[PDB]
Amino acid sequence: YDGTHCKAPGNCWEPKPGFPEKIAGSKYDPKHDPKELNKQVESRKGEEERNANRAEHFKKTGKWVYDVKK
Amino acid sequence: YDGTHCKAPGNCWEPKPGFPEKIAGSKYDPKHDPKELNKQVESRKGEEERNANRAEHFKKTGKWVYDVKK
Amino acid sequence: NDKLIELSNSNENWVMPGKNYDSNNYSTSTQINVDNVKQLKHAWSFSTGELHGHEGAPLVIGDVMYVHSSFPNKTFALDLNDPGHILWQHSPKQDPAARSVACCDLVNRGLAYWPGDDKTPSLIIKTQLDGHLVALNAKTGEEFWKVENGDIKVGQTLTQAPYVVHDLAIVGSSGAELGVRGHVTAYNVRTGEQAWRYYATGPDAEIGLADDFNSANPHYGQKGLGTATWEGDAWKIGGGTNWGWYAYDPAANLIYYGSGNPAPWNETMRPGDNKWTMTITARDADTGKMKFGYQKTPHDEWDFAGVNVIMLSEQTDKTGKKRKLLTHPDRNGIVYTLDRENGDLISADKLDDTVNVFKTVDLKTGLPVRDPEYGTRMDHKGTDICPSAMGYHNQGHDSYDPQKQLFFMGINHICMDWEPFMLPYRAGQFFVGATLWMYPGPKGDRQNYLGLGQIKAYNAITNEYKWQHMERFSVWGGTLATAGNLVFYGTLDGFLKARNSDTGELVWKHKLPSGVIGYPMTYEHKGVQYIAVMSGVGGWPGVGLVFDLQDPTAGLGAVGAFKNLQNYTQMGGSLEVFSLDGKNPYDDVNVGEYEKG
Amino acid sequence: NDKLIELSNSNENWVMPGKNYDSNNYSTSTQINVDNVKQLKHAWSFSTGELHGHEGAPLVIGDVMYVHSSFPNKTFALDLNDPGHILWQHSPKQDPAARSVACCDLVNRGLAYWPGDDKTPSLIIKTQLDGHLVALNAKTGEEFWKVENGDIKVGQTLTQAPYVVHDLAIVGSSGAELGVRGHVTAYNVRTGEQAWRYYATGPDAEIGLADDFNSANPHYGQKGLGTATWEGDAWKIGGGTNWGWYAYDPAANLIYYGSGNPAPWNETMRPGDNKWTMTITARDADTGKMKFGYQKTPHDEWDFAGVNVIMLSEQTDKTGKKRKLLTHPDRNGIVYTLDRENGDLISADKLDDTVNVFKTVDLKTGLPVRDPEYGTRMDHKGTDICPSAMGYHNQGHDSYDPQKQLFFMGINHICMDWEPFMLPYRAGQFFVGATLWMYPGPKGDRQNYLGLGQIKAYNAITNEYKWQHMERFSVWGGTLATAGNLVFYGTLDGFLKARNSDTGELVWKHKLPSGVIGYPMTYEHKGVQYIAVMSGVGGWPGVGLVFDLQDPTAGLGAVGAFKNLQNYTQMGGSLEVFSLDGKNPYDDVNVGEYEKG
Ligand SMILES: O=C(O)c1cc(C(=O)O)c2c(n1)C(=O)C(=O)c1cc(C(=O)O)[nH]c1-2
Ligand SMILES: O=C(O)c1cc(C(=O)O)c2c(n1)C(=O)C(=O)c1cc(C(=O)O)[nH]c1-2
Ligand SMILES: [Ca+2]
Ligand SMILES: [Ca+2]
């Protein structure tokens, strides 16, 4: 794998001698858990909602109130 | 009580107008607990013993070993 | 922000991280120079009340200096006419569990500034280790707003300086070592409202590609690659965080930064180029659309986190074409120059000939040619790999002198051995997967573990190093160039040094309290030029020192490489100010006296 | 220790706390003086890696400087020819619960030194907040011995510098605020064996009276008083700790120190003179027998802890008798002078006319005349009491110039209101029993809470103040006098200042990182005179700052008095070195370079 052989522009990855093109199904399989994988997308929906909530309150009263339970 | 009236040299304490010569038995009684009062004397017997133990071991081997369980 | 442009034109001000939108750390001030530098003395100092790495560098707006500390990210406003009086202070309360998800010390890289209007106060913009971007009224220090921009429960934190462009505050991301997928957001400084937010991996819409993304260089890659160069969903916990520095071109409307390394560090756990990570990125300041994108390190194998500083300039290239350019010394050992309008790759020079992960970087194809002997993979231990994961360059913000057309680079000289291991992903835990051993590279003292830095002056076009000196420790804090023919940089062993910038000669140095990992900066207040730098060792190189580790493989491998640094410095935290003859307001003994008579 | 006497005769050395056995903080060095002091500049600095108060001052033995930090009491050995290289370091591990029983900040007042023989290495003697007295091989920093001399479970800790006399290391005590009964011990530096230990209260045998104790002044009190001036056993938890400074007369074989306040602070809970507390004490260095003892504050009502510095001199008194003398500025507002051989009381002068707890101190009877309106008692709140509990003088180690026969005193100007309350004794808890409100005294700014210090020059015999200046904060760190006609002291607002010692004129000052609560010291290394002082605010005045308190009655009342100090300083921890022209080893740029070429 020297990085110069490209099946497409911006896409030259090759596996190395003795390692597979796909890892799924192999001894390298990461077996990630989708629940875990999505954790950050969920966490960001909360931040954005609470943020939107704090700007809109700010817009209206001219004072930023961090703790959105007001 | 101005500190100048002394029943004896080095001993001029007087109670103040409205306060007693002795506090024991009064609303100022401290009611100290003798067990508590002696705590420090006990604690120092341990330090001195462990210390004596560490110097004597040192005397004999030429190396200070702090933890007296050796 | 045109008001920032104008205030940056005044030597009495240093108004943004990296001083100006060129991010070039250059002052046209001549009052301190090669011919009197031996007269430079200490003028005053200020301690922050915090230990751990102190990165970045203060801001100065006329009469006020603003300084920032390690966690918990105190902000202070000092009165240059009496710098011992603190005009104000902001002391955040943060959950102390933020400490536990910071990979590489409780550091923070600094403050930005939004010059106000008649409706709205000027504002100091700051980040907090616990994820928040906070705006402070710059005259009173009272909270103006505070937005969430990182959850520590999913492994995220903030260590960069944020940045002000127009009426926008831009903020980056930390945690590639905890599987965080890099995100960059712009909030509106008047409203605190989110204006755009984009990611470094996944579907193009989420990454924010412009319709004409890379049109001038389509061999770099164009559509669909933030998913095609992954397997399944491995992009979601893919890294690419951007915790380094920004730069900005007002005419192209483009902000430049580099995105970090992909996760985990175990390359075997993520086949594919891992696109948008490791990428030099240009985004429209206002919509945040990505104009162009050059992946320096396809399928990272070494943690070469692509976040380094970006210095803008105008030069004539080798064919005679007068160009608008960015220059960008990378962890991977390669200093890059691109035309900042289209992406055209112009130079890609090794930072030192010892670099061995690549044989070269082909300019036409823009690919790095890999030496497979220095790569990493499962069940293998790679040996004598240069650069190491700490890079031949890290987060130090360097300088460029546009008169000499020379870049002044504080370099690292640290090689490594490296073995990955399989680990699961669990949100809010570390997600590293390798064990490193690091040591000085070939030109340093490998037996005795000294000789881990260099300082070098470089021309991006001719590709030449005008001069080079080895340094006992990595030069980690960046550098400052001036028109007095001097360059200045702090060392991890606690000196502020000044070399002659034409020749590299060492001409002055002074023992500060602690090692330096911030860059020096300069400003003129009442006709006196002062040079100020943050002291307080830490950051990645300080982790063994700072947390009392001795396992050479601890601190992600930095413990063994720096075992000796603690023979030369301890922790600290302060700002140290210097000037010709130590001239300073207390030269008048009654300034700050209660008696005053 | 005659070897210490001799090394103290060399300006290249500063070998004990207070510099010499006179404890007078005087240097005959003239290289820095009234005529060039404007040329004094910063030479180098060293940060300790710790925050909180940094008290005391380093030691210098030829080429090695030894510095000591706040808890956990690190010791470091610095190489004066390259002070950035740490020769060695000692880092104790201590139980962190020691913090919880320290009344007034994690401070420590410094190191002592035992010059070795041919059988035995020279030794650095240090204390640890957790009660231990540790001896270190002074060239390697390896533990030589470690004895227990304070149990935190019974409320005890160590904050003073210990002291070397002969082949003995003497160590004091802390915790009167936790009911600890003051003890002083001598251990044998060769063997680590206890040589004698005595107490400040109880039966005479336990206190260690000499058969001829006070024979020259029997009206002071003689036998049986450490129990007679108590009720029942209240002496056992009686205070008298000695955490201040020592002095030593080689010919009389006598060490002098003062014992602290009795416990608790509630005077109603302990009727009686509370003897041996509050006492100026002279003990045979070798057997530790108490030769004489003068109680300055009978039945303390104000926490006037009697632990202040003691300065020895030879002067002609007012009758013509050439005398050997001690001079001793007390918390209680009274600066005392006694003949150091017999106890004869010579002068007892108010430190400032505002003192009101006493009308005067009768010299014949040696009694302080009490103004009953400014005393304390249960169910009463005393108002406008001067001095406050922080004293018109605290632990700052002052200087005396034997040429001018003048003492240079850093004073506090803090009055108070005070109400006690009943509380039980529980070993290992606080045992205070009062609520204080403190503020600047009459000559300061009582509304705006500035004006809490003075600096004054004083003659012990004629009783005159040659000059006096008010200072914004209490001058808490002591002072340093030299033959260049300069006196030097640090301020809690972070200046090292130099006044003309003949006139008190302010002639120089420099903004250090943080406030100062250690004393400056001086030494000559390669024909260069350096002035060094510890920076790092804390101790009692810093408690509001250091622990983030706002309740004015918190920190034993110091919080309200110092609410303003944090507008002028934050926490720090470092040693700051100064010299004519900033001359320093790094003047040669290659000292400490990896390249060196
Ligand atoms: O990808 C990340 O989220 C992240 C963050 C940081 C940081 O936030 O300080 C560093 C790194 N990575 C990193 O790879 C690295 O070598 C590093 C060195 C330092 C330092 O300042 O010394 N910080 C960081
Ligand atoms: O009696 C004691 O055990 C004890 C100890 C200490 C100390 O150990 O620092 C102080 C005091 N008392 C005390 O009363 C006091 O005002 C004080 C001020 C300071 C300081 O350095 O600022 N320490 C101490
Ligand atoms: Ca990383
Ligand atoms: Ca006390």
Q: Please state, in angstroms and rounded to a whole number, the distance separating the CA atoms of residues C367 and D191.
A: 71
DSSP C311: E
Closest ligand to residue D183's CA? 2
Contact (Cβ atoms closer than 8 angstroms) between residue C332 and residue C302: yes
D47: nearest Cα among C45, A26, C471: C45
Buried b (16+ CB within 10 A) or exposed e, D260-287: bbbbbbbbbbbbbbbbbbbbbbbbbbee
Closest ligand to residue D241's CA? 2
- Phi, psi angles (nearest 5°) of residue C329: -80, 115
Domains of chain C with bracketed CATH: 1-597 (2.140.10.10)
C226: nearest Cα among C236, C215, C212: C236
Give the helix/strand (H/E) hosting B34.
Answer: helix B34-37
How many angstroms does the Cα of residue C260 sit away from the middle of ligand 3?
6
Q: Which residues of D touch C573 (CB under 8 A)?
A: 47, 572
CB-based contact, D86 to chain C, within 8 Å:
yes
Q: Please state, in angstroms and rounded to a whole number, the distance separating the CA atoms of residues D126 and D103.
A: 20
Burial class (CB within 10 angstroms; exposed 0-12, middle 13-18, buried 19+) of C366? buried
- The C-alpha angle D263, D267, D268, rounded to 5 degrees, equals 120
Q: Is the CB of D515 under 6 A from ligand 2?
A: no
State which amino acid sits at residue C483. A
Give the Cβ contact number of residue C127 at 10 Å.
Answer: 29
Give one word for C276, left, alpha or beta, with left for phi > 0 and alpha for psi -120 to 50.
left
- The C-alpha angle C445, C447, C449, rounded to 5 degrees, equals 60
Q: Is the CB of D539 under 6 A from ligand 2?
A: yes
How many angstroms does the Cα of residue C591 sit away from the middle of ligand 2?
32
Q: Which residues contact B56 (CB under 8 A, 6 or more apart)?
A: none
Cis peptide before C83 (omega within 30 of 0): no
D245: nearest Cα among D388, D125, D398: D398
Q: Is B touching C (3+ C-beta pairs, cut-off 8 A)?
A: no
Q: Which residues of D touch C494 (CB under 8 A)?
A: 84
In DSSP notation, D4-55 reads HHHHHTSTT-B-STTSSTT---EE---SS-TTTGGGEEEEEEEE-S--S---
Q: Please state, in angstroms and rounded to a whole number, the distance separating the CA atoms of residues D99 and C15.
A: 42
CB-based contact, B29 to chain D, within 8 Å:
no
Report the side by side order of strands in the sheet with C194-199.
C163-165, C168-171, C183-188, C194-199
Q: Which ligand 2 atom is nearest residue D157's CA?
A: 8
- List the single residue in D with minimal CA-CA distance to C591: D509
Task: Output the CA–CA distances (angstroms, integers) from residue D181 to B37, D154, D198, D202, D264, in the order listed.
Answer: 10, 10, 10, 9, 11
Strand partners, C114: C123
Q: Which residues contact C35 (CB under 8 A, 6 or more apart)?
A: none
3-state secondary structure of B48: helix
- Phi, psi angles (nearest 5°) of residue C99: -55, -35
DSSP D200: S
Q: Whose CA is nearest to atom 19 of ligand 2?
A: D540
Place of tokens 């995100």: C183
DSSP C478: B
Give one word for D172, left, alpha or beta, with left for phi > 0 and alpha for psi -120 to 50.
beta
Residue B42 domain boundaries: 1-70
DSSP C174: B
Strand D399-401 and strand D406-412: the pairing is antiparallel
C201: nearest Cα among C158, C236, C165, C173: C236
Q: Please state, in angstroms and rounded to a whole number, the distance separating the CA atoms of residues D56 and D40.
A: 22
Q: Please state, in angstroms and rounded to a whole number, the distance separating the CA atoms of residues C523 and C57.
A: 12
Cis peptide before D271 (omega within 30 of 0): no
Contact (Cβ atoms closer than 8 angstroms) between residue D123 and residue D167: no
Cα separation of the two ends of chain A: 58
Cα D487 to chain centroid, rounded: 18
- Inter-chain CB proximity D41 and C45 less than 8 Å: no
Q: Please state, in angstroms and rounded to a whole number, the distance separating the CA atoms of residues B54 and D191.
A: 10
Q: Please state, in angstroms and rounded to a whole number, the distance separating the CA atoms of residues C322 and C530.
A: 35
Return the percent helix, strand and coil in chain D, to nearest 5. 10, 35, 55
Closest ligand to residue D546's CA? 2
- Phi, psi angles (nearest 5°) of residue C328: -160, 90
Return the percent helix, strand and coil in chain C, to nearest 5. 10, 35, 55
CA distance B25 to chain D (A): 12
CA distance C20 to chain D (A): 29
Buried b (16+ CB within 10 A) or exposed e, C196-212: bbbbbbbebebbbbbee
Q: Please state, in angstroms and rounded to a whole number, the distance separating the CA atoms of residues B12 and B1.
A: 9
Strand D26-27 and strand D480-482: the pairing is parallel
Active-site residue identified among C105, C273, C300, C303: C303
Contact (Cβ atoms closer than 8 angstroms) between residue D474 and residue D451: no
Q: Please state, in angstroms and rounded to a whole number, the distance separating the CA atoms of residues D459 and C262.
A: 74
Structure-token pair, residue D418: 């005070």
3-state secondary structure of D481: strand
Give the Cβ contact number of residue D513 at 10 Å.
Answer: 31
- List the single residue in D with minimal CA-CA distance to B51: D147
Length of chain B: 70
Subunit partners of chain C (3 or more CB pairs within 8 A): A, D
3-state secondary structure of B61: helix
| CA torsion through residues D454, D456, D461, D462, sign | negative
Burial class (CB within 10 angstroms; exposed 0-12, middle 13-18, buried 19+) of C35? exposed
Q: Which residues contact A45 (CB under 8 A, 6 or more apart)?
A: none
Q: Please state, in angstroms and rounded to a whole number, the distance separating the CA atoms of residues C125 and C562.
A: 33
3-state secondary structure of C334: strand
Place of tokens 């992406």: C343
Structure-token pair, residue A39: 């954790």
Q: Please state, in angstroms and rounded to a whole number, the distance separating the CA atoms of residues D229 and D231.
A: 7
Contact (Cβ atoms closer than 8 angstroms) between residue D237 and residue D274: no
Strand C382-385 and strand C345-350: the pairing is unpaired
Structure-token pair, residue D153: 């479970």
Q: Please state, in angstroms and rounded to a whole number, the distance separating the CA atoms of residues D267 and B23.
A: 11
Active-site residue identified among D105, D130, D249, D303: D303
Cα D99 to chain centroid, rounded: 20
Q: Is the CB of D293 under 6 A from ligand 2?
A: no
Place of tokens 């740490």: D86
Could you tell which of D129, D159, D259, D274 is best to mutate to test the pocket of ligand 2, judged by most ligand atoms within 8 Å of the CB?
D159
C83: nearest Cα among D493, D39, D562: D493
Q: Please state, in angstroms and rounded to a whole number, the distance separating the CA atoms of residues D475 and C216.
A: 69
Q: How was this structure determined?
A: X-ray
Q: Which ligand 1 atom is nearest residue C102's CA?
A: 8
Strands (E) in C501-566, as ranges, are: 506-511, 521-525, 528-535
HEC secondary structure over C554-573 = CHHHHHHHCCCHHHCCCCCC
Q: Whose CA is nearest to atom 21 of ligand 2?
A: D539
Task: Output the CA–CA distances (angstroms, integers) from residue A40 to C103, C280, C482, in the order listed.
Answer: 18, 24, 44
- Inter-chain CB proximity D45 and C512 less than 8 Å: yes
CB-based contact, B12 to chain D, within 8 Å:
yes
Q: What is the CATH number of the domain that holds A65?
A: 4.10.160.10
Q: Please state, in angstroms and rounded to a whole number, the distance separating the CA atoms of residues D503 and D506.
A: 9
Report the side by side order of strands in the sheet with D163-165.
D163-165, D168-171, D183-188, D194-199
Task: Output the CA–CA distances (angstroms, integers) from residue D486 to C394, D38, D482, in the order listed.
Answer: 48, 12, 6
Place of tokens 């870049």: C407
D362 given a catalytic annotation: no
In DSSP notation, D89-133 reads EE-----GGGGGG-TT-S-----EEE---SSS--EEEEE-TTSEE
Cα D13 to chain centroid, rounded: 21
DSSP D474: -
Q: Resolution, rounded to a tenth of an Å?
A: 2.5
Give the helix/strand (H/E) hosting D225.
Answer: helix D225-228
Structural domains in chain B (count): 1
Give one word for D114, left, alpha or beta, with left for phi > 0 and alpha for psi -120 to 50.
beta
* Alpha helix stretches (DSSP H) within C467-524: none
D261: nearest Cα among D310, D300, D205, D221: D300
| CA torsion through residues D59, D65, D70, D75, sign | negative
Exposure of D163 in the CB half-sphere (CA atoms within 13 A): 27
| CA torsion through residues D125, D129, D132, D137, sign | negative
| CA torsion through residues D100, C542, C172, C16, sign | positive
- Inter-chain CB proximity D231 and B23 less than 8 Å: yes
Would you tell me which residues 186-245 of chain C have a C-beta closer than 8 angstroms to some C-beta of chain A? Answer: 191-194, 218-222, 225, 228-229, 231-234, 236-237
State which amino acid sits at residue C409. M
Strand C480-482 and strand C26-27: the pairing is parallel
State which amino acid sits at residue C455. I
Cis peptide before A15 (omega within 30 of 0): no
- Phi, psi angles (nearest 5°) of residue D338: -130, 150
Give the helix/strand (H/E) hosting B53.
Answer: helix B39-61
Exposure of C414 in the CB half-sphere (CA atoms within 13 A): 33
3-state secondary structure of C390: coil
3-state secondary structure of C268: helix
How many angstroms does the Cα of residue D241 sit away from the middle of ligand 4?
8
Q: Please state, in angstroms and rounded to a whole number, the distance separating the CA atoms of residues D193 and B56.
A: 8
3-state secondary structure of C103: coil
- Inter-chain CB proximity D570 and C450 less than 8 Å: no
Q: Please state, in angstroms and rounded to a whole number, the distance separating the CA atoms of residues A3 and C227.
A: 18
Strand partners, C529: C524
State which amino acid sits at residue D351. L
State which amino acid sits at residue C513. P
Cis peptide before D115 (omega within 30 of 0): no
Long-range contacts of D362-369, Cβ-Cβ distance < 8 Å, separation of 24 or more: D362/B4, D365/B4, D365/D219, D366/D217, D366/D219, D366/D220, D366/D294, D367/B3, D367/B4, D367/B6, D367/B12, D367/D298, D368/B3, D368/D296, D368/D297, D368/D298, D368/D332, D368/D334, D369/B2, D369/B3, D369/B4
- List the single residue in A with minimal CA-CA distance to C148: A47
- Inter-chain CB proximity C273 and A46 less than 8 Å: no
| CA torsion through residues C12, C18, C20, C26, sign | positive
